[PDB]
Amino acid sequence: MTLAILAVFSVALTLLGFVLPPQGVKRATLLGLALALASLLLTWGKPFAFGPYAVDGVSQVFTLLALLGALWTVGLVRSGRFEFYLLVLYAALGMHLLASTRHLLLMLVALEALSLPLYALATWRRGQGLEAALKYFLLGALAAAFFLYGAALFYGATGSLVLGAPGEGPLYALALGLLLVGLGFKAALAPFHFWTPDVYQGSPTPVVLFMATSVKAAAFAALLRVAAPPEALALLVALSVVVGNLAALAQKEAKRLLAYSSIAHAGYMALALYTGNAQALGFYLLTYVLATGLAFAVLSQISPDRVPLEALRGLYRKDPLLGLAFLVAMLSLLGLPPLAGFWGKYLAFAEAARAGAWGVLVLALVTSAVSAYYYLGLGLAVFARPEETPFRPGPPWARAAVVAAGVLLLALGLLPGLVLPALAAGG
Amino acid sequence: MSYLLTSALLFALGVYGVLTRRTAILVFLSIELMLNAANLSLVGFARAYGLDGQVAALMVIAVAAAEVAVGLGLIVAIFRHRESTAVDDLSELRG
Amino acid sequence: MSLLEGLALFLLLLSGVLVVTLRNAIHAALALILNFLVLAGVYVALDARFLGFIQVIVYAGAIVVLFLFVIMLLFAAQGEIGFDPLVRSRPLAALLALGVAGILAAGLWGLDLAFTQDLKGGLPQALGPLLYGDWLFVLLAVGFLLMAATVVAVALVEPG
Amino acid sequence: ALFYGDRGLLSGYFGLGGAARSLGQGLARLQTGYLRVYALLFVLGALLLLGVMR
Amino acid sequence: MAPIQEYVGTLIYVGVALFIGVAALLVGALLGPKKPGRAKLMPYESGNDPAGEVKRFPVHFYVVAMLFILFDVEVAFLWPYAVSAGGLGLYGFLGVLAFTLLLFVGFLYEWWKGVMR
């Protein structure tokens, strides 16, 4: 009954914004998200299904992650337009619906409901932002067409539109492929990656935070429901990680480089899809969401429009806590011990090796070592001499958020045997 | 069965449209054609598997209408002040 | 069947070719409306009647009407302006279209299905219990999506 | 001579790193910024996946 | 339900109507003086500029049309409940009421914001 809370708050605030100041509307949105998260906690171990809508461990964990990312990205945004919060609420409900169902068509409806408000949230009205929004909308509608024809071929290969049906040979394979195309585009996997660098570079940094956390979480949640063949999985992972890290090498801008890094990270997470453990993936995504939200909150404190690499430098001298947290996030995204990003990486690789994919796992690891070049060129740049760069050292809001994110990262890296025991039913 | 093959053909036609068209609006139109090809495949398979693909396609139509509304609003906002819609005119974002 | 069925399928294919070929936006849209009409006729022939009627009403009656409104507000009929022709891209696009047709043709080839079910006409009389029922949740999600789309477009234009 | 040879070996390691970077910038050059280019590459990758599935 | 024979009769109706329309067009086009002149072909209003050069028309028409597509989708969903009503009971009534109220809240937002713009 968390979806009920989400829908009630969205519909109410829609009209309430006429009599309420946008600040009051933002307060209301924050309260609703926190209350939904509290309900998710109190329902831990209470799987609940009504229709095709189903809340299980996966729904709980991934919607927890999405709610966290949405709370963080809303905290930063102070625009006096309550619609800029209505859209976030809509996207949150849509991603919950996406993660909580197996019905392909309801999955499509949830996809559209979560994706449309992001297209509008990508409009700071900066000229690049319109180009980004246009590329995003066009490629997203194309992928929606592909996913819909895949659902049709699924309904062709089997009498139902719900995943798990037995499935035919080549036609079922074709339907599975046509669903995987859209799901990977939404997960920023190569060779469907081209939109991600442009969109991350064009969209405002807090929005990109929201995206790179909640969108990736819900996307991998829905991916776990598919029975993706190992050869297709191998191809996606290889291309994604290779192109991501390589093209990230060439990037001069922090947001675009992070987009390519996120392509490589989606490639990594796609390994747990071999077995679909979802405990390994739940943990991985917990760590990655925290780290990326941290990094993008810092990038938002630096500049919403665009942050170059040199802007990151001197961040320690400016704010030591911010410099240290940014370093920790870069390391957790590199996947290095003793951090929870490393534990998520290890769990995904363990699922992959259990699936018996060796060459693919090796290539992923090589490309991950390649990623250390730019991961260090970001984390260590914090200590360089401050060049001319705009710096607004955040509110205690964002300071405490970034600090708590880094602390949770390191704590679950040191003792994953605390939360990892309850990513299943939740004992 | 001819209907499902015809739907695949219409899908390919809409793909060619999306690739060839210079205008965002005509790209979106080709996308709508792809969506309707999918709806026809759904209707054939609903005739096969008992009518659920009909309600499916209905929901699909509703979703298509919503996304059309949103995308046309975006197209207008991007090319109201700006000149010719040609999508190659926006190349600022590069690798 | 096949006599007029082949006719209807040829009309559908030709209308799609027109909508993707013609450089006049108005002419393409009109080809697409003809496509939707032939497709609703095929729907009726496939015992889906209410769905064909809604395809005419919403898609043809409303959706492409809004499309025509947009392209008449912003003339854009002669699309080939600001070319960046990339002539090499036309044969590559034709190739990609042929391939996306061939892979589906392979997936559906050697595929025969039991098209024998008594839909009783895709009438809303029989479709209602499915829509409000098993599909009621999907319906509510769709309605929420529509409301969100209204608010999205409203805040999206909103000059200020 | 062995010292200079070790120096040159380290330089070849540098050359390998630069070859990796060059490959990376070619892959970043793969993204020109034209939506038609992005969409063509997208459809290409999707067909490649569907073929691999067999 | 109803037989397909009435639908074939509907096709016949359309064919007859179209044939009669084409006949009327042939009479009108063929019977005429046919003296084209430059000023006669000139659009309107004494030399140039009936409309002349004007920039893109108001988006008000776009707004009306988009509103229309969404509410027409609404009506398209309301019709199956309109036919199958008594069997769906209070539960179907409540579901359709929820759907209607959602889209009416959307309408109320767009109205209190208004489109004179």
Curated annotation (Swiss-Prot), chain A:
UniProt GO BP: ATP synthesis coupled electron transport
Keyword Membrane annotated: yes
Compartment list: Cell inner membrane
Ranges that cross the membrane: 1-21, 30-50, 57-77, 79-99, 104-124, 137-157, 172-192, 204-224, 230-250, 257-277, 280-300, 322-342, 360-380, 400-420
GO molecular function: NADH dehydrogenase (ubiquinone) activity; NADH:ubiquinone reductase (non-electrogenic) activity; quinone binding
Biological role: NDH-1 shuttles electrons from NADH, via FMN and iron-sulfur (Fe-S) centers, to quinones in the respiratory chain. The immediate electron acceptor for the enzyme in this species is menaquinone. Couples the redox reaction to proton translocation (for every two electrons transferred, four hydrogen ions are translocated across the cytoplasmic membrane), and thus conserves the redox energy in a proton gradient required for the synthesis of ATP.
Stated name of the protein: NADH-quinone oxidoreductase subunit 14
UniProt source species: Thermus thermophilus (strain ATCC 27634 / DSM 579 / HB8)
UniProtKB/Swiss-Prot annotation, chain B:
Catalytic activity line of the entry: a quinone + NADH + 5 H(+)(in) = a quinol + NAD(+) + 4 H(+)(out)
Keyword Heme attributed: no
Alphabetical UniProt keywords: Cell inner membrane, Cell membrane, Membrane, NAD, Quinone, Translocase, Transmembrane, Transmembrane helix, Transport
Family matches, as InterPro entries: NADH_UbQ_OxRdtase_chain4L/K (IPR001133), NUOK/Mnh_C1-like (IPR039428)
GO biological process: ATP synthesis coupled electron transport
Keyword Magnesium applies: no
EC number, UniProt record: 7.1.1.-
Example of a GO cellular component annotation carried by this entry: NADH dehydrogenase complex
Superkingdom of this protein's organism: Bacteria
Bilayer disposition of the protein: Multi-pass membrane protein
GO molecular function per UniProt: NADH:ubiquinone reductase (non-electrogenic) activity; quinone binding
Localization, UniProt: Cell inner membrane
Classification via NCBIfam families: PRK05715.1-2
Purpose of the protein: NDH-1 shuttles electrons from NADH, via FMN and iron-sulfur (Fe-S) centers, to quinones in the respiratory chain. The immediate electron acceptor for the enzyme in this species is menaquinone. Couples the redox reaction to proton translocation (for every two electrons transferred, four hydrogen ions are translocated across the cytoplasmic membrane), and thus conserves the redox energy in a proton gradient required for the synthesis of ATP.
Annotated family: Belongs to the complex I subunit 4L family.
Annotated protein name in UniProt: NADH-quinone oxidoreductase subunit 11
The species this protein was found in: Thermus thermophilus (strain ATCC 27634 / DSM 579 / HB8)
Curated annotation (Swiss-Prot), chain D:
Location in or out of the cell: Cell inner membrane
Entry's transmembrane regions: 33-53
Coiled coil feature spans: none
Entry's family note: Belongs to the complex I subunit 5 family.
Complex and partners: NDH-1 is composed of 15 different subunits, Nqo1 to Nqo15. The complex has a L-shaped structure, with the hydrophobic arm (subunits Nqo7, Nqo8 and Nqo10 to Nqo14) embedded in the membrane and the hydrophilic peripheral arm (subunits Nqo1 to Nqo6, Nqo9 and Nqo15) protruding into the bacterial cytoplasm. The hydrophilic domain contains all the redox centers.
Function recorded in the entry: NDH-1 shuttles electrons from NADH, via FMN and iron-sulfur (Fe-S) centers, to quinones in the respiratory chain. The immediate electron acceptor for the enzyme in this species is menaquinone. Couples the redox reaction to proton translocation (for every two electrons transferred, four hydrogen ions are translocated across the cytoplasmic membrane), and thus conserves the redox energy in a proton gradient required for the synthesis of ATP.
Protein name listed in UniProt: NADH-quinone oxidoreductase subunit 12
Curated annotation (Swiss-Prot), chain E:
Reaction catalyzed: a quinone + NADH + 5 H(+)(in) = a quinol + NAD(+) + 4 H(+)(out)
Compartmental location: Cell inner membrane
Chief localization: membrane
Signal peptide: none
Molecular-function GO term, any one: NADH:ubiquinone reductase (non-electrogenic) activity
EC number: 7.1.1.-
Top-tier EC class: translocase
Alphabetical list of InterPro entries matching this protein: NAD(P)H_OxRDtase_bac/plastid, NADH_UbQ/plastoQ_OxRdtase_su3, NDAH_ubi_oxred_su3_sf
Mode of membrane association: Multi-pass membrane protein
Pfam families noted in UniProt: Oxidored_q4
Regions crossing the membrane: 11-31, 59-79, 88-108
Keywords: Cell inner membrane, Cell membrane, Membrane, NAD, Quinone, Translocase, Transmembrane, Transmembrane helix, Transport
CC per GO annotation: NADH dehydrogenase complex; plasma membrane
Family (UniProt): Belongs to the complex I subunit 3 family.
Quaternary structure (record): NDH-1 is composed of 15 different subunits, Nqo1 to Nqo15. The complex has a L-shaped structure, with the hydrophobic arm (subunits Nqo7, Nqo8 and Nqo10 to Nqo14) embedded in the membrane and the hydrophilic peripheral arm (subunits Nqo1 to Nqo6, Nqo9 and Nqo15) protruding into the bacterial cytoplasm. The hydrophilic domain contains all the redox centers.
The protein's name: NADH-quinone oxidoreductase subunit 7
Taxonomy of the source species: Bacteria, Thermotogati, Deinococcota, Deinococci, Thermales
Gene (UniProt): nqo7
